[PDB]
Design a protein around this ligand. Structure first.
Ligand SMILES: [K+]
Ligand SMILES: [K+]
Ligand SMILES: [K+]
Ligand SMILES: [K+]
Ligand SMILES: [Zn+2]
Ligand SMILES: [Zn+2]
Ligand SMILES: [Zn+2]
Ligand SMILES: [Zn+2]
Lengths: 389, 394, 389, 394
């Protein structure tokens, strides 16, 4: 990470989103490579959609090196993949989830080549970012430039379990809250300098888009239909949230998310956005919003089927000792919570996590809200039941 | 060649860096694309003013810098001559200065398949961040828009250089920035293909809004700041609005009647060659307002804002009070050429409608001046590069 | 009490509130004493938290005279305590409830020494005041100056049964209503002169703070977490309410509260704020607020678990004769109700007490509100059940 | 020495008493701290004007009063000389007059471990109720803030004395009061330690709001009242806002850029010594508005209010139209000293930014004057204690 006093805005060169977009891969990929490309994906993604990209490139005269991602983004495994990339490789194309995407960025960076990131679900805003989580969270690694192209095929996205999209909404929800806290604290942005106004408006676009279309996108996803509303949220979850957080910044929400892993146990079953959503509520308690404002956000998360209580998160019996541990992890020197002008100690973090739980339980009681998020068997498991009405 | 798609597309430079004395921190950013060799292109004026600050920074950090002087003529012949002066091991092309220099840099970089770094020395238009290049005959007449497959890699702005430039330049940039929201909203609401090549993204629409909002809050304070030579945050906000916001806002949205009218106006010639891009675009934006049929009160709100910023809102101020109906019909025909951006609008027009709207703006503005007793007037300077004839500072 | 035509604002010299503040006693106490101090508390408070203050002072070279409050704030008992205070005592520190606090103020005043008041619960706004109730209520006694320091350790406050905090909210709720009535009647303030604008805004701060944070503070208290919301209400219940009422004034609400004691019976089981809350509703009837406005306040009290009916107060069968007695007591010559420009007779007071009961019952019916305050076994007893959702 | 804590702290005088002819009721309040012996300190001017009214009241009630004359010089040498003139059985120190007298009283009282009674004779600043004492070299240059462990015990104001003073004094107090809400909001929103030593209380924030609201409603009516010599409730409201509200509002909140800028300005010297505290603070508040990046319209709303109150909003009015860039950089450096309150702001600055903002305020105000045709102007009197050069009464 390099800090500066200049006003800085960062972004991928291109963001392309559309139904069946993979069948049009070449018209976009050709901007960086017309001769040779590497396509990296785990076997599951190869079985399901990666060949659509390969077919497009091959039909247009390109040589495509198809690599199978082992599933573990370790330095040893990454080095082995790089060694399988032909000398004349012009671009690294990653297709799949976060580990695959981060692996593509790493290999592309190592070979001084452009990268094309193709998410297969809209579960987080990591796609467009120049950073890669280094892990228990340790720190954030910042590449000097953002991936060159974020390529999204919404036919692939709409076919995934709606739990993935919801996790993505959870991650997108934290963007406005965290970025506003960073900007209003006059802290350096995740772009390396003073926050731009443009970035603030993109974070706003994310907020507004979710408010108007989050539920219709969810219903659309569940029904398997690629409505414009669904496409709007895909953009919010990926482009808007991505640019909004990197050009703005992370704060308490994500630090708390990283602190949660310290608990382990059933926590490993939660998706990123599910934890980030709860963490956002925790930041709201730390920011001391009036209870009515907390309820407005908690109710929205509830309507989107996001967990807002310790019970739904699957850790209703977490101990005070465990929470203090989360608090200490949350406050590590390099965590994002330090971007906030307000400062905290571990007990305050622990207290806020419990307060969210009580506030949410009260809201459920007051409104008679009966819907509840039930933690699935594993992190990649679909919802236990169909949330469709 | 421009290529349209059915996908939702957002396009942008990889980095946008803005700060006072930023050129003294050039290597810090340039190193992302080149650590060994770079070409710095600028006309003699810019070399005297600030280009050496960039060179010094890169040199003090172990880089070899090829210093080229833009001949002021952005001709393919001159551009190819420049390209031949670029070492084969050149890693990046750095253009420092105005539109001609910036476009020459993009051309050369594209021709060499190299990344580009654009450093505007004034904030007079939003061309810096775009993948476009305005092509015009040696007479000045607009021909068409050329599109590059990717945007410049880095837009690097030193606000100490910007604040030292004549405020007429900043105002021209405000005029250009003012049309962004109007045109992009028109393209989006007409459901036309964006200048990014696909369906307009929501993000681009919000960046256009950011532009509009920032100008409303800070345009006049930035103008006063520039005039007084002080680099306030307000001034910096407008530099961002004029460059980053207007740039991403228009390319990810689109151009419409305003710019098409600007291109048609150039066909008038005469004193019109002394007008800066934004001065013409501002008038063209009012013309689009007439074509969009906004109620008069709404036209007045925009015209009054332009007047406060010292932008011309009448034919008299533009320097062509005696323009003939036949000349205006000529502008209308030029405005409606097949390749013009006005065709992105769902509402369609004929030459006489363009000509009528140009005159309507003049009458509307004159009425507003009379009703409000507004006495301030834009007076056209000797050349398009000259400062105001008088100091606009209160 | 001394009346004046000047505009007067009165207040303690310092108000300090924080979690574990008692462990930092010396840094604050030293402003008045660095050699010798008396710490007065009943045995229960000594067992639970008073030694934290003693330890801080002793670790900083001070001699601390530890006195045990007998539990009865009688002149005979107070004289005996004064006689136990060393000749070189520099300050009197009272730790505990109202009787202990009033005893400290009395002894400090008698010895011409500064006083430090340390409430162990946030149940009333008496802490910062220069007055002490003289009792059946008889009259208000006004000390020439306010206690010098109000010292609050929120770790102690958050550990107390939430019923105490709620009683405090009940007392704080009357501040804006009563002070506004005093100011708008152009009556002399409880500070001795024309009401200041500053005092009016502090009463407003109290009102606004409760509106935004009362319920979250309650939930926090119940969960045992010291959130900023909880701290905000502690400030509202103590500092804001305290300054807001003394610089403004008392009116019908508190006079009615004093009138209630005349009933005796189960009334002795109610906490101050619980009676004051009902009394505030009674003042609303006397002020003739439209029913909708009455409902807005009654609903708020209900959400905070405050009693709004005669049934909840534990006197559903109070007779008309008994109510007339309350009315006569309420209207005694030195009562605060006389500060109101509108004048009343006993039957009007009785009628208003019954009207509140009917209005509240109608609101409960209309809204289907089922929550109810159940009068505990004694005044210091916790709620019969857990109000946590 | 100032001590910071993690606790939420509110600090205040024990009593604040304000009323017309109040000094004739001195014993009634003074008796709370002393019934046998008291020291009354005031310069000769104040003794002639009202100090004897206080003495008479205490005497007529059996008190022994030590009458001391402030030599006008608030030096430690002179202060210690005064302390030596105070009887050992002195129960309280009463300071009557302006800042120097009030600070001398607080110092002596603190030195003798005795309560203090502060009686301002003008409502020109909010220093009366504070636990602070501005320390400045004999040249006038600000050095640092000294903090007392407790606030003065009683602030006693006789509004008949206040209404008889030149209205320039009240206006200076309005200027000082205007910065309270701006600075305190900045300290609170930056989550910085308050001037009370801990986390800002909600109560202090509302008292700052009370100040802002009262000035908005009654500042001009109080000014007209003072000018006409009538003690209306409106006038009394502003005396409370200038003294109690502004006082508790700033100390329980905090100082920020405005006052730091005021301290930096004093370093300019020249005619700047003729400006009253509030006149400088008002300009400094506008500078903070520029540093906070408020949209121009919001700056205009505050500047227009200051102009209506007859406060200087331009360098011309301040009496330093020709101030040099180097002098302004000097102010910037002084403003940013380690001990300055500007560091409470989350946004950080360098000297050139301070200098730029000072000039920006001047240009913004000049533009507002032009746009609105505002002709009223503050004209700097011969000394900081002189009344206006002309009668501002309509
Ligand atoms: K996010
Ligand atoms: K534009
Ligand atoms: K009360
Ligand atoms: K102030
Ligand atoms: Zn995330
Ligand atoms: Zn343009
Ligand atoms: Zn009470
Ligand atoms: Zn001041």
């Amino acid at each position: 990470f390099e800090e500066s006093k200049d006003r800085i805005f960062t972004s991928p060169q291109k963001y392309v989103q559309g139904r069946h977009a993979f069948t049009r891969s070449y018209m976009y990929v050709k901007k960086w490579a017309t001769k040779s490309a590497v396509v990296l994906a785990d076997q599951n993604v190869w079985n399901i959609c990666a060949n659509k990209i390969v077919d497009s490139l091959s039909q247009n005269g390109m040589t495509v090196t198809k690599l199978v991602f082992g599933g573990e983004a370790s330095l040893v495994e990454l080095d082995k993949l790089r060694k399988q990339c032909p000398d004349d490789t012009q671009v690294i194309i990653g297709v799949g989830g976060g580990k695959t995407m981060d692996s593509a960025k790493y290999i592309a960076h190592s070979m001084n080549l452009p990268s094309i990131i193709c998410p297969t679900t809209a579960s987080s805003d990591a796609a467009t970012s120049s950073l890669s989580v280094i892990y228990q969270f340790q720190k954030y690694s910042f590449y000097p430039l953002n991936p060159n192209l974020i390529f999204i095929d919404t036919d692939v996205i709409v076919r995934a379990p709606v739990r993935f999209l919801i996790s993505g909404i959870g991650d997108a929800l934290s963007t406005w809250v965290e970025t506003e806290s960073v900007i209003r604290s006059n802290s350096t942005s995740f772009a390396g300098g003073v926050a731009s106004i443009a970035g603030r408006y993109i974070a706003r676009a994310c907020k507004d888009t979710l408010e108007k279309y989050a539920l219709s996108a969810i219903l659309s996803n569940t029904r398997g239909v690629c409505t414009e509303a669904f496409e709007n949220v895909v953009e919010a979850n990926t482009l808007m949230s991505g640019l909004g957080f990197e050009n703005g910044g992370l704060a308490a929400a994500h630090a708390i998310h990283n602190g949660m892993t310290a608990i382990h146990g059933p926590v490993h079953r939660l998706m990123h956005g599910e934890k980030v959503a709860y963490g956002t509520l925790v930041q709201v308690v730390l920011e001391d919003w009036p209870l009515e404002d907390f309820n407005n956000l908690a109710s929205f998360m509830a309507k989107c089927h996001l967990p807002i209580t310790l019970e739904e998160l699957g850790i209703p019996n977490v101990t005070d000792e465990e929470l203090l541990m989360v608090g200490r992890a949350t406050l590590r020197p390099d965590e994002s919570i330090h971007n906030m002008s307000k400062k905290f100690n571990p007990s305050q973090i622990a207290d806020a996590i419990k307060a969210v739980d009580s506030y949410s339980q009260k809201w459920q009681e007051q409104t008679g809200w009966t819907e509840r998020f039930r933690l699935p068997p594993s992190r990649h498991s679909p919802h236990l039941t169909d949330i469709h009405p």
